[PDB]
Curated annotation (Swiss-Prot), chain A:
UniProtKB keywords: ATP-binding, Cell shape, Cell wall biogenesis/degradation, Cytoplasm, Ligase, Magnesium, Manganese, Metal-binding, Nucleotide-binding, Peptidoglycan synthesis
Sites where the protein binds ATP: 149-200
Pathway: Cell wall biogenesis; peptidoglycan biosynthesis
GO biological process, one term: peptidoglycan biosynthetic process
Cofactor binding note of this UniProt entry: Binds 2 magnesium or manganese ions per subunit.
Span of domain ATP-grasp: 122-317
Role according to the record: Cell wall formation.
EC number annotated for this UniProt entry: 6.3.2.4
Name assigned to this protein: D-alanine--D-alanine ligase
Recorded catalytic activity of this chain's protein: 2 D-alanine + ATP = D-alanyl-D-alanine + ADP + phosphate + H(+)
Cofactor: Mg(2+); Mn(2+)
């Protein structure tokens, strides 16, 4: 194999540890020679053997090299950013790689920024006619104006892994939920809580001609699909294909591919939906989905006949056929 | 407080030369010690004396240092990207500066990326209830479907300075218009042309919650506000305050601030509008407006009591305010 890939994991967002878990899964299956670079929680980079050491430790609070790191970029044919959340999944790292001129996996600057913002992505989806849950944006230090009645879900606008998210039952509890959310972002969303709800997820793979995996369903005992439920082995019930009538599954895949085109994604996405009283809502799109042992995206494509090494090989090829097209 | 500013100008977009002219304006009025760095048209950087030489020449086709440059970033307290268009105004350079950790002037990654894309920004604004002209996007290689009558304006979705824009009067000319646009972007927009039309502009200054300048109106003799009209001395007249009914000036300023807040813009924008048959349309936001001798943003704020050195002072201060 002449191909050489640079995997970047870790990061400064609250999903630092999740990103390192995703790295273990990708490195276990990727069929190209791949080097790891870790972004420690302080923003400094660990390279070579120190990055592997940090991987085993499953967290890297302190790094060695201030950005930009002394990394030999010219050794790598493709860069694979596996950095969930702010400063990784939101276009920041993508902007750096664009300036380096390196082919890289996944969505570009604008689609990455847009899909990380739960307010702006919903505006664009709603404008395209995609159903989304009623919501309002709230900015820090500005009084909330919620045209609908609780229960609410309150989120930092740029969150992942359910960090900073509250299920809010009483309006009295809103200001506490917003204040938690504002620990992670200057902007929060307040959404109408669907209850009861089923949670459906579908993977997409492609640049211009996205293709959808089978639909999967998540079930759990907790009050919502929270951080502990997402990453504690065994806690989440991952059902593939979703135990749903085939027509609803078809509508979910159609909506996912529509949203992928509307939001301008490339490389990959995991698209999350809610199903409530027969109605589908697109919840969000994640441009760098998790690859942890409890993550849906590699499992969805496995069920669709795309094995884990093949899935990773296709992501790397799509990175190269995007760049060549310019 | 000590304050040393690093100004970056030039860039790889078609607004390269415009950006160097903006740099001349900024350097003439900025009240802080400021060094220039130039991105040449080939993407390589010029530092120190070679950057000032590039600036004097008003164009830098070739640079010295491949990205990322050996620039002594620690010497600067604030970075001021003055790079108009693709790879300077669209979030890419902002993403690098975010990872560098330095305060920097103007909109962040997401607001920069969205305001540069004429299709995406119209989607968001239209959803938020801001009036915008009818439009469609066209991807390179796909057949356009334009569901309204000509005339049209055809544009690269990422353009600035009117580069690659055509007024299309008949369907037979659409193909040539789109081929022109696709030299500059993989996505084009086709908009319903308003005709006749008046053009209004408002400056915004601030972080997310902005303050609006007076409204200015641009007049010119050319068929539209094109590259030559924009940058040739005397071709464009700025009427400030614009001749509007009082309800209309207020509506323009409210719409600008609403769009600014929805998009989450920081630092500055110049927000452009159309007025046709008494109806307002928001045309675009520019997060790195021009500072050339014929540019409107410094004049809009001059008319609202904010002189040029004070405008630049507030932009640098806003960058630090956000960073803290
Ligand atoms: N409007 C809602 N109604 C019901 N449940 C919700 C709603 N919004 C969020 N949730 C619950 O919170 C979970 C996380 O919300 P969301 O998908 O917005 O967060 P995330 O942090 O972006 O997720 P991921 O880790 O997939 O990136 C959902 O899986 C669901 O359990
Ligand atoms: N829909 C339209 N109807 C009428 N005139 C138009 C329309 N779109 C563009 N124009 C004309 O084309 C000019 C440039 O359009 P636009 O503002 O979209 O380009 P830009 O390159 O982003 O401008 P800037 O240099 O201000 O960034 C307008 O100022 C106007 O003269
Ligand atoms: Mg998410
Ligand atoms: Mg989710
Ligand atoms: Mg513009
Ligand atoms: Mg304009
Ligand atoms: Rb997301
Ligand atoms: Rb809304
Ligand atoms: Rb713009
Ligand atoms: Rb449209």
């Amino acid at each position: 194999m002449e191909m050489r890939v640079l995997l970047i994991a870790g990061g400064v967002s609250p999903e630092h540890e999740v990103s390192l878990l995703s790295a273990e899964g990708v490195l276990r299956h990727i069929p190209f020679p791949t080097d790891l670079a870790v972004i420690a929680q302080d923003g400094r980079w660990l390279l070579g053997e120190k990055a592997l050491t940090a991987l085993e430790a499953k967290a890297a609070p302190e790094g060695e090299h201030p950005f930009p790191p002394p990394l030999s970029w010219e050794r790598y044919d493709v860069v694979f950013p596996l950095l969930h959340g702010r400063f990784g999944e939101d276009g920041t790292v993508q902007g750096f790689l664009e300036l380096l001129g390196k082919p890289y996996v996944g969505a570009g600057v604008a689609a990455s920024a847009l899909c990380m913002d739960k307010d702006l992505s919903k505006r664009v989806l709603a404008q395209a006619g995609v159903p989304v849950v009623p919501w309002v944006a709230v900015r820090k230090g500005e009084p909330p104006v919620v045209p609908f009645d609780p229960p609410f879900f309150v989120k930092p606008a740029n969150t992942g892994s359910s960090v900073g998210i509250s299920r809010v039952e009483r309006f009295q509890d809103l200001e506490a939920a917003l204040a938690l959310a504002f620990r992670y972002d200057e902007k929060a969303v307040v959404e109408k809580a669907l209850s009861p709800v089923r949670e459906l997820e579908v993977g997409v793979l492609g640049n211009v001609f996205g293709e959808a995996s089978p639909v999967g369903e998540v079930r759990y005992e907790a009050p919502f699909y929270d951080y502990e439920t997402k990453y504690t082995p065994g806690r989440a019930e991952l059902l593939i294909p979703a135990p749903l009538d085939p027509g609803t599954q078809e509508t979910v895949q159609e909506l996912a591919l529509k949203a992928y085109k509307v939001l301008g994604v490339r490389g990959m996405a995991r698209v999350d939906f809610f199903l409530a009283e027969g109605e589908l809502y697109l919840n969000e799109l994640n441009t760098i989905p998790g690859f942890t042992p409890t993550s849906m995206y590699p499992r969805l494509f496995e069920a669709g006949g795309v094995a884990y090494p093949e899935l990773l090989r296709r992501l790397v090829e799509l990175a190269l056929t995007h760049h060549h097209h310019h």
